[PDB]
RNA sequence: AUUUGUGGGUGGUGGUGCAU
């Protein structure tokens, strides 16, 4: 009886609520049917038509004037910042253990760099990259240029000694580390195409397709 | 002197809007925004007794079709009074969801609502709960840089008050742009809050609240580089003489990490 | 002449225990 008379008291008062709701909807529908044009005749019959603004106008020039963004955030505790990184270090560690179970063309930029000098052309290119980034597809092309141009230079010369070559070389290493943490799909495409080309060259000529550039290719991808 | 058909249509539309909860709005109400005597039609239809959802819809229609001045006048003369009445006589001082939606729309189109309500709420003396709700709504839906700077300059040039200080605290949480003139206005407000050792007003000896202390702390955390050497020294002096006991450390840290522009 | 591309905040229009 309690599950019936409640169902009775509900739906009765629900339909009572529904009929009342439908009545107001019908009144609004009637308001849009005849009272709508009557309201148009209503407006044709009836008729009904500073200092802070100056301060606002003064603030209007105080809005297009000078500006400086420095909205800092909270303060990171030393242990707290240390722990999250330790957590971040750990998060890739078990993931490793779980893994232990399961600007465009080369010569377009090579001629640009050869005209320059590879002692700081990297830093110059880093600026050129940062410029583009300030404006990711071009960055992927840039990383492709970086890779094949590193291979190119290592193929080209060894006149720069261990204290003239390794400087810009490790600069390229750090640059490509950053661009690896930023971009990975393109890098994989680059390495895969290069290794297929490696095989093709080897197959055409076993020993006559060796490269120091290939050596440093292996080394850099291994430390990457 | 109004027509009988006009009065009957206005009363019927007001009753239909008050009793309406869901569905479509009337075509009379839709063409009211494209009419001249909108304020008179709304007064005849009694929008204070109408539905908050219908009021939010009418405000959106006026902001999307009608003019800015008529929208500001309607927004002030309906929404400010309705929000004040709802805040004063709510069951637990709770704001309506549809009214909050209308206020968010009015903040998204801030060329009208500022001069309609923001100066009017401070002039009418909004309570602590009303000021807190206004600050929360502003922080949820802020406005463009020009409107935010105009509102901040108006609130700073207005006298010291609990609602104005709470509005300043919410604006500092939003962290809008402060030019040289806005930073000068903030420094002048801080100097007026600080005492003057010959003629002094009331804020020189008036106590400052925790809301004002938090507003000063957020302003120091946000616009440290927008204050020069003299302005940073004045801010540090204000935070030492009339600053808080527990916010003095963060205030001095910000005033020393700030750089002259 | 508002909108798109880059980043990023992701919880209290909070309930509650208690004191006065």
Report on the architecture of this protein.
The structure is cut from a larger assembly and holds chains A (224 residues) and B (261 residues). With 224 residues, chain A is an all-alpha fold. Helices cover 72% and strands 0% of the residues of chain A. Chain A contains 11 helices and no strands. Chain A has helices at residues 5-31, 35-43, 51-60, 78-91, 93-99, 106-115, 121-134, 137-156, 165-182, 185-204, 212-223. In chain A, helix 8 (137-156) packs antiparallel against helix 9 (165-182). Chain A is elongated and about 95 Å long. The relative contact order of chain A is 0.05. Chain B has a domain at 48-186. Chain B has 14 helices and no strands. The termini of chain B are far apart. Chain B is mainly alpha-helical. In chain B, helix 1 (4-19) crosses helix 3. Classes of the chains: A mainly alpha (224), B mainly alpha (261). Chain B binds one RNA strand of 20 nucleotides through helix 8. Chain A: Interacts with snoRNA U3. Interacts with EMG1, MPP10 and NOC4. Component of the ribosomal small subunit (SSU) processome composed of at least 40 protein subunits and snoRNA U3. Chain A: Involved in nucleolar processing of pre-18S ribosomal RNA. Has a role in the nuclear export of 40S pre-ribosomal subunit to the cytoplasm. Chain A: It is found in: Nucleus, Nucleolus.
